[PDB]
Every structure is written in structure tokens, then in C-alpha cells.
Write an enzyme that holds these catalytic residues in place. Structure first.
Site, short mmCIF file in Angstrom:
data_model
loop_
_atom_site.label_atom_id
_atom_site.label_comp_id
_atom_site.label_asym_id
_atom_site.label_seq_id
_atom_site.Cartn_x
_atom_site.Cartn_y
_atom_site.Cartn_z
N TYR D 51 0.82 -1.20 0.00
CA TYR D 51 0.00 0.00 0.00
C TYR D 51 0.86 1.27 0.00
CZ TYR D 51 -4.54 -2.31 0.52
OH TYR D 51 -5.69 -3.03 0.28
N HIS D 113 -8.70 -6.89 -2.68
CA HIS D 113 -7.92 -5.98 -3.50
C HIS D 113 -7.54 -6.64 -4.82
CE1 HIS D 113 -4.58 -3.30 -4.78
NE2 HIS D 113 -4.12 -4.45 -5.24
N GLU D 124 2.97 -5.15 -7.48
CA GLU D 124 2.30 -5.94 -6.45
C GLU D 124 2.64 -7.44 -6.46
OE1 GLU D 124 -1.77 -4.72 -6.82
OE2 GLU D 124 -1.22 -2.67 -6.27
C1 LIG Z 1 -10.18 5.53 0.36
C2 LIG Z 1 -9.96 4.61 1.54
C3 LIG Z 1 -9.49 3.31 1.35
N1 LIG Z 1 -9.32 2.52 2.42
C4 LIG Z 1 -8.82 1.16 2.27
C5 LIG Z 1 -9.81 0.24 1.54
C6 LIG Z 1 -9.24 0.15 0.13
O1 LIG Z 1 -9.32 -1.20 -0.34
C7 LIG Z 1 -7.78 0.58 0.25
C8 LIG Z 1 -7.35 1.53 -0.86
O2 LIG Z 1 -8.33 2.56 -1.01
P1 LIG Z 1 -8.72 3.02 -2.50
O3 LIG Z 1 -7.46 3.09 -3.33
O4 LIG Z 1 -9.63 4.22 -2.37
O5 LIG Z 1 -9.66 1.76 -2.91
P2 LIG Z 1 -9.27 0.52 -3.89
O6 LIG Z 1 -9.02 -0.65 -2.97
O7 LIG Z 1 -10.51 0.40 -4.76
O8 LIG Z 1 -8.03 0.97 -4.61
O9 LIG Z 1 -7.61 1.24 1.50
C9 LIG Z 1 -9.56 2.97 3.73
O10 LIG Z 1 -9.36 2.18 4.69
N2 LIG Z 1 -10.01 4.22 3.95
C10 LIG Z 1 -10.22 5.06 2.93
O11 LIG Z 1 -10.64 6.22 3.16
#
Ligand SMILES: Cc1cn([C@H]2C[C@H](O)[C@@H](COP(=O)(O)OP(=O)(O)O)O2)c(=O)[nH]c1=O
Ligand SMILES: Cc1cn([C@H]2C[C@H](O)[C@@H](COP(=O)(O)OP(=O)(O)O)O2)c(=O)[nH]c1=O
Ligand SMILES: Cc1cn([C@H]2C[C@H](O)[C@@H](COP(=O)(O)OP(=O)(O)O)O2)c(=O)[nH]c1=O
Ligand SMILES: Cc1cn([C@H]2C[C@H](O)[C@@H](COP(=O)(O)OP(=O)(O)O)O2)c(=O)[nH]c1=O
Ligand SMILES: Cc1cn([C@H]2C[C@H](O)[C@@H](COP(=O)(O)OP(=O)(O)O)O2)c(=O)[nH]c1=O
Ligand SMILES: Cc1cn([C@H]2C[C@H](O)[C@@H](COP(=O)(O)OP(=O)(O)O)O2)c(=O)[nH]c1=O
Ligand SMILES: [Mg+2]
Ligand SMILES: [Mg+2]
Ligand SMILES: [Mg+2]
Ligand SMILES: [Mg+2]
Ligand SMILES: [Mg+2]
Ligand SMILES: [Mg+2]
Lengths: 130, 130, 131, 132, 132, 131
Positions: D51, D113, D124
Site C-alpha cells: 500500500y 484488492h 504488487e
Molecule cells: C479511500 C480509503 C481506502 N481505504 C482502504 C480500503 C481500500 O481497499 C484501500 C485503498 O483505497 P482506495 O485506493 O480508495 O480503494 P481501492 O481498494 O478500490 O483501490 O484502503 C480505507 O481504509 N479508507 C479510505 O478512506
């Protein structure tokens, strides 16, 4: 053509198996005759429902469990309904049934279904006195 | 975190889709807060629930239909619950939803879900006055 | 507004054991089977008629080749607004919730044909159900 | 042509018992497993690498604490247009028909994810399957 | 080795919308369709031939009137031990796990017929697919 | 009475796209994954150990051949009475309601192995999870 009583126990709500369980009874062509949601069942009602067991040592753990979460009480109607829904409930050993496919503990076993004409009449009067 | 009102219409019972419908709401992590089975809904209750529509010419066929079979009234609770369950209900045009996958008539469409905070508060008071 | 439309379960459906899954999606939307035929091998003739509008395409022969590569079932479905609603059930490989959206992953091997208009239905139905 | 992409089954999926449900939707869309690992607890630096583009956000620490709160499964899937097709399958909690649309109701606890780009995908994959 | 067997999807299956559900269970057990016919209304003599061993029973006429009360589908399935395996799938209304066990609750309206023996199988197949 | 058992998803499972379906049946009975490994090809060595008790059988080599014909996943499952309950989930090709009962149709190509006793589990688990 009979009526029988079903309880969907708290663990069903925990594991989100409520519709799964009801679905199995629906897909076997049994009809809902009446139905109640209990966020927490009156412990008195639970104790009556399990009166038979008051002498067993597991009794209190049982009442505790049956009141630790929501339950649904259902009156189902259909041909041979008591016997059939019993088979449907099954046991945690035999695949194809509700307990056989989904449950795994002798205590946390998802559903109750009356096991006789007498207990059915009795259990319906308990949850549906009207 | 909101509460919303759902009705499962008579056609769901006809087509034995009751658990299927509830299952979709369950599997999206919404919780039953309260619930009622109506073998035949009081026509008064139906008329209130659809007051908004009393001026439409389809109104009476609608009330007739909503009272021609069982219905279940549910109060669901969950994050963004009103908006989400609405999307879940969907429409008979868009696959992935309840109406999109299962329904097919503008009239016989399986489920009702409140569409706003005001109608939700209102519709809950109708079916669950306590 | 009752209607009729023509559906083909393609050879990838059988290959992959998704025949019941596909039909079941049509059944749950309350559409009724009106005529049905199983074909262990479809006459290359009938196919080419079915895809006559595509006869001038690059993909025309691989299409035909594939459509004769295994069994197919032609079904005539019936229900309110069937032509267009079954079309949305079929969807595309890009839209989850539809048959292709959930089960298919290829431009060509895509499990199901459904009539795209009334002209096509009336026309297609005739091909597969001359009677 | 064929792509590979990286998927993570998050801890909420194990808690709610939706691991088979999730993998199932990808299996039914005709995607194949090339690699797979089960972690009873994913090491925190793996999570933090995975991440890393998120390292400056407020939510960054809570996200990682969550991803470490239970088991996770990492999977390399292979299929035509896998990256985009599987991104779409994941969808979001507003889109019925997708994994997050049918099964999820939280911005953070969203079950799965999947890599969102060709590069993020290749990146990744080396994190969870560095032995290649 | 390979056998073929004859299945009938009865009218109750169409009424209750369980046609795909039923065919599905046989499909998932790895049985293949060799022949298939849809009858909006099966001719009464076909029905009467198909149940000819039943001609002396009280229920005989009601059975035939039922089998003619709606559409039916006849299917020849091919698979290892098909006759016995598919008989078992059908089961009865007392056996959870089978078609009649999960979905049926009537002695007559029981959704499906399958051939119960090698000969009855060969016989039943010539009735519905005489063009062979 | 918590227990651990060893499960193999066999190559026919992948071939036929029934991996999720199989695992999901184990998941719904409330069993938990404790260790898991994906094998695109399983070392003929490990296999033969796994089926060492069958080494003197007619079917011993076709067994092995098949078990190396495609991917396999070894899983260690955990739950009350797991060894024996997962065994009943696996069932046989004759009993509907079980995995083999619903999905398999062959003595050999039967989708899943599950430990038949504690001795076999402790033993099998070691083979596939030496650590
Ligand atoms: C936007 C956001 C994501 N997350 C978490 C869940 C998401 O799976 C991950 C990354 O966010 P994001 O990149 O917005 O979602 P995606 O997984 O669709 O790329 O982090 C949070 O915990 N809080 C948040 O405000
Ligand atoms: C017999 C028994 C019951 N129970 C508890 C769990 C069950 O939900 C409840 C009822 O058990 P029992 O009446 O034996 O079975 P059924 O649910 O088929 O009527 O009592 C135990 O915890 N241990 C036991 O040995
Ligand atoms: C708008 C509309 C509604 N109805 C009936 C059927 C519906 O069950 C009911 C409500 O319709 P409407 O309020 O438009 O949709 P929703 O169910 O999303 O609130 O009224 C018709 O029969 N025809 C119509 O054109
Ligand atoms: C357009 C297109 C179609 N096909 C095949 C598969 C399609 O089902 C058929 C017609 O294509 P198309 O009209 O794109 O799809 P539909 O089935 O929705 O009409 O021909 C290809 O193989 N490649 C292509 O690029
Ligand atoms: C025994 C029986 C069967 N039937 C119907 C349903 C059965 O599918 C069919 C033949 O009966 P039977 O040979 O008993 O059942 P099966 O289909 O398992 O061979 O006739 C009746 O209508 N009434 C009856 O009393
Ligand atoms: C007995 C037997 C097994 N096998 C194969 C498939 C089986 O999964 C494996 C061991 O057979 P068996 O012990 O009968 O089954 P299980 O998997 O329940 O232990 O070897 C055959 O191919 N033919 C046979 O006759
Ligand atoms: Mg009892
Ligand atoms: Mg409205
Ligand atoms: Mg087109
Ligand atoms: Mg992203
Ligand atoms: Mg018989
Ligand atoms: Mg053995």
C-alpha cells in the site's frame, strides 16, 4: 397437511445464514403461515420452549445462547410438514441438510424444528398464543 | 447509519423468491431490526403506504395486488442503508439487482424499499407504530 | 407487451458446463420457453444465415467454425418485453451482473446469442424454427 | 492477450466467511490461479509495501492494522485482460453485480484488492511472490 | 462404461420455475446431453407409452393428465453409470440432497423422471427419440 | 474437540472450475483454513508418500499420473471434529449431498482428498507442510 414450529437461532444471524436456512424450507414448497422477529427473546419463552430439558445440566448454557442474539419464530404449513422440515433440519453429521451442510457444534446448530405432533402444537402455542 | 423500510410483495411468495430477496440484503451486511408477516395486509395500511399514488389511475390495481397475497414488512439497519437497499432493489432493466435479475413487470416487482429519509421515517411508522 | 426472442446457447457453454446456469438466469427473470431444439452439431448452413449480416467481416469464418465446434441449443423465449430484456441479461464481457459479464471473458467465446431487435427475432426465429 | 494480476482476499472476507464466494466469482469468469499464498497473518512490511502509494494518507495506519487483523490470501490470476476485468469484478460498494457491490458496505472493509494497472500489477506481484 | 438414460422434466418443474435448477444438478454431476426435446404439450400416447408399466394402477389416469398439464422436456443423458447415478440424484421426497428431497413434497408432482433400469432406459429412449 | 485435517483439491477440480465450489462447501460448515499451498505441479515424490498405502495397487500409477496432471492445492483445515466431518463432506460418488455425490462421477477423477483418520492427518499434514 400439518403446521410446525421453527426457530432460527442466534448463530444463524451471526453467520448471516438466515435466508440460506429459510430458502431451503421455501424451495421444498412449505409456506409461511405466521412469523415473528425477536431482537432478544423473552427468557421466559425460551425456558418454556425447552422445558423438557430443564433437568439436563446443559440447560442454562442453552438458554443463555438462545437469548444472546436475535431469533425468528416461524409457523410453516405443508404436507407432512412436521416430519419433512425435521429431515430438512437434519443433524450436523449428514450432508444435504441444514445442520449437515452448515452447522458444526452440538450447541450452535442454527435451527429448531418441532419433532412431533404434540410438541408442534405445544411450541406454536408458546410463540403464537393468539 | 440509517434504518429503512422494506416490503416483500405477494409475487415474491407466489414465485417462492422470498428467501432469495432477503438473502441479497443479508449478504450485503444489513441487519433485521424488526419484522412482520401479513397473510393479507390490512388494505388501510396499504393505502397509507401508497398515499402518494392515490391520484394515479393505476392506484386501485396496485392496492388490489398488494393485498392478494402475503407480505413481509422489514426494518433494516446499516450504513447508508436507505440509499444502498434502494440500489439493491434496482429496476427491472438493470441486471445485478433484485428487480433486475428477478422481476419483469412494472407492476409485479417483488420488493419495496423506501427512497428517501422522509419516506423511510414515514413508512416505518406505518408498519411499526410502536 | 408480450414478445418472443431467439436465444442460442453456444458451444463454450457446454464445454464449460454452464448451460443450466445460463438458462436459469433467463428462467429467474420470469421468461418462458416456447420452443427448444438441441443440436449436437449445427448445420453450417443455418449458422451462416444466422450470422449473414456478419458475412463481410474478418471474424466471419472463425465465428462459424466455433459455432459448429460443439453442441448448441436454440430456444424461443417469451415474456413481457422479452427481446430487449434478454438482451440486457446477455450483456457484455465488461458489465458484471450479466451472463457475459459474470461468465465470459472473450470477444468470440461468449456463451450466448440473443436477438438484438424485433426484426432480428422474427428473422432468427424462422431460421431455427422454420415450422 | 494474457495478463497476470494480483488479488488479495482481505480479513473481513475470512471473518464473514466469503472466501469461496469471492474466489468463485473470479473462477466463474474463467480466470486461472497461477500463484497462491495463505497468510495467517501477513507480515506488516509486506502490507506496508503493498500500500506504499497510500503512505501519506490519514487512513494509512488504520488500513494496515486492518489488513493485519486476520488472515489474507494473495493470488496471482491469469486471463485475457485480467487486470481490467478483475478490477471491474471487484467494483465498488455502489455497483450491484460486483464483489463490493453485492457483499460489502464499508469503505475500508471491502473484502478484496485487485491491481489497478499494468505496472501496479507487476509491482504488487513481486511483493507477494518475490521468488520471481 | 458409458450409459445413456432418459429424463423427463415434468410440468410442475415449469410451473415452479425449477427447470434450470434440475438440469443443473445433473450438469454439475458431469452428465452430458445427447438428445433433447421441448414439448409445450406432450402427446398423450407418448405419455401413456412411457408409463405403460403403470397402466393397471388406480393413479394411472391422473398421472397422465398431470404429465399433460403443462410442458415437459425429454433429455437423453450420457455418462458413466448414468442410469443409476441419475436415479440416485432424483432420489425421493424423503432424502435431502436429491432433487425430490430438496425441491418436492408430493407423491405425484415430483418434478422429474429418470429411467430406473438398463432395459426401461433403452425402451423409454425409443419412445421420445424413435428416430433412432 | 478441536482437530486438524489435510485436504487436497485435485486436478479435475481446476480442469472443471470447481475449486471455489468445493472450498465453499467446507467454508459453510464453519471450518477454518490454517495453512494453504498452491502447486502448479505436485512433486511426484510428495504424491507417492501421500498415497504410500496404495503403492501395491493396480491403480497406483494412474493415480499418481493423474495427481500430477495439473495443479493441486493442499489445505489444512481446522474445526470441531474436523477430520471426520470433512470426510463426510467429501462423501462418495454414490451419495448426493456430498462433494463427490454432487460433483464427481468417476472412481479416480474425484475432485478431493480428505484425511480418513487422525493418524492419516498427522501423517499427511507433515507431507504437505513439513514446516
Ligand atoms: C479511500 C480509503 C481506502 N481505504 C482502504 C480500503 C481500500 O481497499 C484501500 C485503498 O483505497 P482506495 O485506493 O480508495 O480503494 P481501492 O481498494 O478500490 O483501490 O484502503 C480505507 O481504509 N479508507 C479510505 O478512506
Ligand atoms: C442433547 C444436547 C443438546 N444441547 C443443546 C444444543 C441444542 O441447540 C439444544 C437442543 O438439543 P436437542 O433437543 O438434543 O436437539 P434438537 O435441537 O434437534 O431438538 O440443546 C447441547 O448443548 N448438548 C447436548 O448434548
Ligand atoms: C409508476 C407505476 C407504478 N405502478 C405500480 C407497481 C409498483 O409496484 C408500484 C410502485 O411504483 P413506483 O412508486 O413507480 O416504483 P417503486 O416500486 O420503485 O416505488 O406502483 C404501476 O403499476 N405502473 C406504473 O407506471
Ligand atoms: C465483433 C466480433 C464478434 N465476434 C463473434 C462473437 C460474437 O458473438 C459474434 C458477433 O459479434 P458481436 O456483434 O460483437 O457480438 P453479439 O454476439 O453481441 O452480436 O461474432 C468475434 O469473434 N470477434 C469480433 O471482433
Ligand atoms: C406411486 C405413485 C406415483 N405417481 C406418479 C409420480 C411418479 O413419478 C410416477 C411413477 O410412480 P413411481 O414408479 O412410484 O415413482 P418413480 O417416478 O420414482 O418411478 O407416477 C402418482 O401420481 N401416484 C402414485 O401413487
Ligand atoms: C480404489 C480406487 C482408487 N482410485 C484412486 C482415486 C482415489 O481418490 C484414490 C484412492 O482410492 P479410494 O481409497 O477408493 O478413495 P479415497 O480417495 O476415498 O481414499 O485412488 C482409483 O483410481 N481406482 C480405484 O479403484
Ligand atoms: Mg428435540
Ligand atoms: Mg417510490
Ligand atoms: Mg449484435
Ligand atoms: Mg486502487
Ligand atoms: Mg420407477
Ligand atoms: Mg480412504
Amino acid at each position: 397437511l400439518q403446521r410446525t414450529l421453527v426457530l432460527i437461532k442466534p448463530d444463524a444471524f451471526e453467520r448471516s445464514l438466515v435466508a440460506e436456512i429459510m430458502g431451503r424450507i421455501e424451495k421444498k414448497n412449505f409456506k409461511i403461515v405466521s412469523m415473528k422477529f425477536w431482537s432478544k427473546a423473552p427468557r421466559n419463552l425460551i425456558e418454556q420452549h425447552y422445558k423438557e430439558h430443564s433437568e439436563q445440566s446443559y440447560f442454562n448454557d442453552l438458554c443463555d445462547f438462545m437469548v444472546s442474539g436475535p431469533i425468528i419464530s416461524i409457523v410453516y404449513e405443508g404436507t407432512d410438514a412436521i416430519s419433512k422440515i425435521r429431515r430438512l433440519q437434519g443433524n450436523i453429521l449428514t450432508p444435504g441438510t441444514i445442520r449437515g451442510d452448515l452447522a458444526n457444534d452440538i450447541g450452535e446448530n442454527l435451527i429448531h424444528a418441532s419433532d412431533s405432533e404434540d410438541s408442534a402444537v405445544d411450541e406454536i402455542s408458546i410463540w403464537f398464543p393468539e
